[PDB]
Amino acid sequence: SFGGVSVITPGTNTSNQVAVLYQDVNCTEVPNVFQTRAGCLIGAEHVNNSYECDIPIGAGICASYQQSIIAYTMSLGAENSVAYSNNSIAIPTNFTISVTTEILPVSMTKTSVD
Amino acid sequence: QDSLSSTPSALGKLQDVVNQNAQALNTLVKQLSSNFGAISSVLNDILSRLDPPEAEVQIDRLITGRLQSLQTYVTQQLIRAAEIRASANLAATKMSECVLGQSKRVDFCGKGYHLMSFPQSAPHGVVFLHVTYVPAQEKNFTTAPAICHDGKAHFPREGVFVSNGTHWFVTQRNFYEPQIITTDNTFVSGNCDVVIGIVNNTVYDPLQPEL
Amino acid sequence: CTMYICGDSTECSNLLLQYGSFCTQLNRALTGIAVEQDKNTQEVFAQVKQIYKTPPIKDFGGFNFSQILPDPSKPSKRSPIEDLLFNKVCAQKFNGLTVLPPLLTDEMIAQYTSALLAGTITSGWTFGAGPALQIPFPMQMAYRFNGIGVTQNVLYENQKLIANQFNSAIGKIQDSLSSTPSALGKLQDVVNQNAQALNTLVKQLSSNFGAISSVLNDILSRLDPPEAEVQIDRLITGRLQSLQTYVTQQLIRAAEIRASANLAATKMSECVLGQSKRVDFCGKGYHLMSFPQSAPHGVVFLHVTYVPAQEKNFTTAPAI
Numbered sequence: 001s002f003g004g005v006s007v008i009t010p011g012t013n014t015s016n017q018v019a020v021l022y023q024d025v026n027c028t029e030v031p032n033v034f035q036t037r038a039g040c041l042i043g044a045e046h047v048n049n050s051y052e053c054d055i056p057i058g059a060g061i062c063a064s065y066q067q068s069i070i071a072y073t074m075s076l077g078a079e080n081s082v083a084y085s086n087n088s089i090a091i092p093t094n095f096t097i098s099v100t101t102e103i104l105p106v107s108m109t110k111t112s113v114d
Numbered sequence: 115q116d117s118l119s120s121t122p123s124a125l126g127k128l129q130d131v132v133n134q135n136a137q138a139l140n141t142l143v144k145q146l147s148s149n150f151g152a153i154s155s156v157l158n159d160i161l162s163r164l165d166p167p168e169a170e171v172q173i174d175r176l177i178t179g180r181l182q183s184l185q186t187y188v189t190q191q192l193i194r195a196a197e198i199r200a201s202a203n204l205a206a207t208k209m210s211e212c213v214l215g216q217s218k219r220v221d222f223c224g225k226g227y228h229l230m231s232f233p234q235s236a237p238h239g240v241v242f243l244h245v246t247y248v249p250a251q252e253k254n255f256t257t258a259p260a261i262c263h264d265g266k267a268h269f270p271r272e273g274v275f276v277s278n279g280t281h282w283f284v285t286q287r288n289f290y291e292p293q294i295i296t297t298d299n300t301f302v303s304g305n306c307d308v309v310i311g312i313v314n315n316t317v318y319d320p321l322q323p324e325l
Numbered sequence: 326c327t328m329y330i331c332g333d334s335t336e337c338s339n340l341l342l343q344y345g346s347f348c349t350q351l352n353r354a355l356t357g358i359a360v361e362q363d364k365n366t367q368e369v370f371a372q373v374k375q376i377y378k379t380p381p382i383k384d385f386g387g388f389n390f391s392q393i394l395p396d397p398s399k400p401s402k403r404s405p406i407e408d409l410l411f412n413k414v415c416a417q418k419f420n421g422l423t424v425l426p427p428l429l430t431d432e433m434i435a436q437y438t439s440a441l442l443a444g445t446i447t448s449g450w451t452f453g454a455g456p457a458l459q460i461p462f463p464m465q466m467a468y469r470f471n472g473i474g475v476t477q478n479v480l481y482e483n484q485k486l487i488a489n490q491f492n493s494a495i496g497k498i499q500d501s502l503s504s505t506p507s508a509l510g511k512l513q514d515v516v517n518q519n520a521q522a523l524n525t526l527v528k529q530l531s532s533n534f535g536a537i538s539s540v541l542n543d544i545l546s547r548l549d550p551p552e553a554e555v556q557i558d559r560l561i562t563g564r565l566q567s568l569q570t571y572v573t574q575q576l577i578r579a580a581e582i583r584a585s586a587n588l589a590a591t592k593m594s595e596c597v598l599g600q601s602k603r604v605d606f607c608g609k610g611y612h613l614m615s616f617p618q619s620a621p622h623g624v625v626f627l628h629v630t631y632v633p634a635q636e637k638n639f640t641t642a643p644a645i
């Protein structure tokens with residue numbers, strides 16, 4: 001058995017706690033233990049609650065710092081039922097003026113190597 | 115103004131370009147420390163120690179390694195340059211279509227209905243401030259595809275037919291502004307037998323009270 | 326890079342150090358590609374703020390979306406068309422070659438797709454610009470007719486005809502995919518190109534590159550360290566060149582895929598979340614609306630267009 005070792009961490013500006021993912025292995029062969037499609041995750045608490053993805057692990061699993069590191073299946077967003085009918089229409093009675101930013105690269109530093 | 119002043123990661127897209135280029139150069143310079151199988155990574159050490167035949171062997175090893183390192187760098191720069199060019203082409207397109215005009219293209223000039231945009235220059239990049247109209251405070255109404263009056267089927271010229279529960283009006287689509295249904299804001303097509311869901315209501319003719 | 330070149334030989338590994346940071350560079354380059362692939366998927370499919378659902382009763386004025394909507398009886402919750410698309414498209418690990426799983430599972434991609442469909446069907450183009458606003462489907466279609474310069478009464482007066490042409494056209498998509506082996510060639514070609522590149526890379530481990538043997542263990546079992554270092558260096562040179570060739574090709578291919586993903590994301594916004602005036606951008610004919618369907622490592626758009634028919638000659642004048 002062989003594979004990569006990856007360390008999951010919140011910034012060192014936030015915490016010194018880490019979780020370790022042993023890629024492609026069963027948790028039995030390694031030497032808060034959770035088996036994922038990406039491998040064996042150790043040091044993170046697995047919960048049934050779902051959140052926006054913070055640090056991606058793979059196959060739907062993400063981790064975040066909430067204190068301890070937790071692992072969870074990521075949410076794709078809030079569920080919303082549109083009140084559809086064959087004679088119902090919704091019309092805005094107000095509006096808001098929104099301003100948003102978009103940032104794009106244009107150029108690089110012009111390097112030259114002799 | 116306030117968001118940029120309190121968000122360290124706001125300009126990540128531009129910082130990433132700076133970081134990637136710095137990393138590539140630092141790697142290239144660090145490769146000069148490699149021996150590549152030679153007795154020393156330092157060319158002056160080789161020349162001070164060995165006569166030309168033996169020295170040529172050691173030097174050739176350094177040339178091979180250093181040439182490979184430089185080729186790797188240049189290839190990566192060409193690939194990265196292409197990516198930047200694509201970004202610049204997109205930025206140029208946005209300048210033309212978002213700043214020098216009003217765009218109908220969905221999500222091309224920000225989220226919502228595009229009104230206008232303003233460019234701001236940035237280090238090795240451009241920032242666009244997109245101004246959009248976003249609908250708010252919607253309410254439910256009853257609707258119909260057509261109004262039946264005098265045996266004729268009437269359709270809205272510009273808006274949509276709505277009811278507040280007791281009375282029928284025509285309104286513009288993106289902003290509730292109910293108006294009395296008249297021959298000035300509707301048009302007639304055929305009779306009332308064809309349209310599914312047609313409802314019975316009065317259609318007003320402005321010259322009626324006059325003549 | 327280290328395992329590919331040297332396996333678990335410490336003799337080779339120590340020699341590889343003489344070449345500096347080449348392997349760190351190669352590992353970094355491949356990691357960058359892997360990250361991009363999840364970004365590509367996100368930019369295409371995660372364009373919806375909320376997970377929208379259709380009503381329990383599918384009454385849309387005669388329009389039938391059953392072939393594009395999720396089929397609740399199937400465990401994957403894919404649509405009939407998506408299920409068809411998905412049906413149509415070890416030793417590497419042993420040499421240091423692995424495959425990382427996508428961040429978004431196929432189930433999750435299907436969920437995004439069905440949310441986009443529910444949004445479009447129940448609220449038209451409003452959910453793209455702000456809060457979803459419900460409108461009867463026939464009225465939505467009437468608005469889309471106005472968008473192509475056709476009066477709304479044309480839609481209403483021909484509602485059953487239009488719904489029938491639509492339902493039939495969708496059915497033909499179902500039938501065409503079920504009888505055309507080459508239909509998903511664009512996606513299959515990507516799979517084939519990547520497989521070929523990996524197979525080539527692995528096969529290069531069989532090359533001698535001028536050494537007495539392609540097998541590192543044969544060299545180490547036969548020769549003492551001075552003579553062995555010469556043979557090993559030959560294998561390192563060849564294997565490093567092979568890996569560099571692979572990575573460069575992957576970077577170029579990755580860029581091409583990214584361009585395709587950027588286009589797919591643009592079509593999602595302009596064809597699915599709105600009605601497009603751009604000629605030939607959202608299918609041939611005058612664009613009315615589009616519906617996304619997810620596919621293996623890709624996306625399929627079903628473009629609905631208005632195509633004029635049965636023209637007749639008339640005399641005309643610029644003015645009366």
Ligand SMILES: *[C@@H]1O[C@H](CO)[C@@H](O[C@@H]2O[C@H](CO)[C@@H](O)[C@H](O)[C@H]2NC(C)=O)[C@H](O)[C@H]1NC(C)=O
Pocket residue numbers: 389390391392496
């Ligand atoms: C929507 O269209 C589908 C076909 O694409 C209809 O489903 C078929 O219905 C007939 C009975 O009328 C069955 O014999 C077929 O086996 C069904 N086919 C499939 C694939 O399920 C569906 O009934 C239509 N829905 C409505 C409301 O008309």
Ligand SMILES: *[C@@H]1O[C@H](CO)[C@@H](O[C@@H]2O[C@H](CO)[C@@H](O)[C@H](O)[C@H]2NC(C)=O)[C@H](O)[C@H]1NC(C)=O
Pocket residue numbers: 486489490635
């Ligand atoms: C417009 O074209 C449609 C075809 O799409 C014609 O509708 C068909 O008419 C034939 C008889 O000529 C019927 O047998 C078919 O069942 C109809 N098809 C559908 C989907 O209803 C329609 O008649 C044409 N209209 C005009 C004015 O020519």
Ligand SMILES: *[C@@H]1O[C@H](CO)[C@@H](O)[C@H](O)[C@H]1NC(C)=O
Pocket residue numbers: 013122
């Ligand atoms: C690091 O933490 C400090 C507070 O202790 C905070 O002010 C600072 O912004 C943080 N830096 C980053 C990059 O988040």
Ligand SMILES: *[C@@H]1O[C@H](CO)[C@@H](O)[C@H](O)[C@H]1NC(C)=O
Pocket residue numbers: 026028
């Ligand atoms: C290893 O994990 C797999 C699931 O990924 C499981 O089916 C298998 O039984 C496990 N093996 C052992 C010895 O637990």
Ligand SMILES: *[C@@H]1O[C@H](CO)[C@@H](O)[C@H](O)[C@H]1NC(C)=O
Pocket residue numbers: 046047048
């Ligand atoms: C999550 O749910 C499973 C049952 O589906 C249960 O066995 C498990 O203990 C739960 N874990 C937590 C932290 O709730």
Ligand SMILES: *[C@@H]1O[C@H](CO)[C@@H](O)[C@H](O)[C@H]1NC(C)=O
Pocket residue numbers: 083090252253254
């Ligand atoms: C519209 O009516 C539905 C019920 O059919 C209700 O759930 C919804 O909140 C209403 N929306 C508004 C904006 O009034």
Ligand SMILES: *[C@@H]1O[C@H](CO)[C@@H](O)[C@H](O)[C@H]1NC(C)=O
Pocket residue numbers: 278279280281
């Ligand atoms: C509908 O609008 C009319 C005219 O403004 C008004 O008189 C009537 O009371 C309104 N009906 C309801 C239920 O608000």
Ligand SMILES: *[C@@H]1O[C@H](CO)[C@@H](O)[C@H](O)[C@H]1NC(C)=O
Pocket residue numbers: 086087310311
């Ligand atoms: C709308 O649906 C209701 C039943 O829920 C039906 O009675 C009514 O006639 C339908 N209206 C149209 C235009 O189909």
Ligand SMILES: *[C@@H]1O[C@H](CO)[C@@H](O)[C@H](O)[C@H]1NC(C)=O
Pocket residue numbers: 262265313314
């Ligand atoms: C509308 O009025 C006509 C008579 O002018 C009548 O025949 C028809 O049934 C009415 N429609 C409804 C829904 O009451």
Ligand SMILES: *[C@@H]1O[C@H](CO)[C@@H](O)[C@H](O)[C@H]1NC(C)=O
Pocket residue numbers: 636637638
């Ligand atoms: C229009 O007239 C031309 C002759 O000038 C004829 O060849 C053509 O077939 C006619 N087309 C139609 C649609 O009637």
